[PDB]
């Protein structure tokens, strides 16, 4: 049933945000929409800063003019090759920019916090709550893009 493969999903979505809201320490947004929030690269580009303390890593978000995505999703990429973590683990800018698989960004948000909480150098991801749930009209939102894409959900349950 895709209505409970999109209530899996969104677990994992809802798992991602709460672990990056814990460690920016602030409010992410509605979990339906959070994949979306991070095709500019703005929260991902904290993320980095976060672990780089000693880099001034300049971070665009212009509300005047319209500024380039890329440049704060390349901050988050070099950083998750710079540690040397496998590319499985990662997506591509294509994935995130053009929205073409955000789930693989959310199983990268799940792999990168694996791999730094191991190494004790951030606090771990968080299975959701057991009674976690969202409304009907957001788990449709997930089943009908679903539907419009070939894109196969990754495995969250491995890492
Ligand atoms: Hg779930
Ligand atoms: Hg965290
Ligand atoms: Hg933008
Ligand atoms: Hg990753």
Redesign the pocket.
């Known amino acids: 049933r895709e209505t409970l493969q999109a209530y899996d999903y969104l677990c994992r979505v809802d798992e991602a945000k709460k672990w990056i809201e814990e460690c920016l320490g602030t409010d992410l947004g509605p979990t339906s929409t959070f994949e979306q929030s991070l095709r ?1 690269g703005v929260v991902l580009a904290l993320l980095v800063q976060k672990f780089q303390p000693d880099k001034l890593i300049k971070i665009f978000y212009s509300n005047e003019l ?2 380039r ?1 890329s440049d704060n999703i390349n901050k988050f990429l070099d950083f998750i090759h710079g540690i040397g973590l496998p590319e499985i683990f990662h997506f591509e800018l294509t994935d995130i920019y053009e929205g073409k698989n955000l789930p693989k960004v959310i199983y990268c948000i799940h792999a990168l916090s694996y791999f730094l909480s191991m190494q004790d150098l951030a606090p771990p991801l968080i299975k959701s709550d057991e009674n976690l749930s969202f409304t009907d009209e957001d788990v449709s939102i997930i089943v009908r893009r679903l539907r419009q894409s070939n894109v196969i959900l990754p495995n969250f349950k491995a890492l």
């Open positions: 500019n319209q500024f995505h």
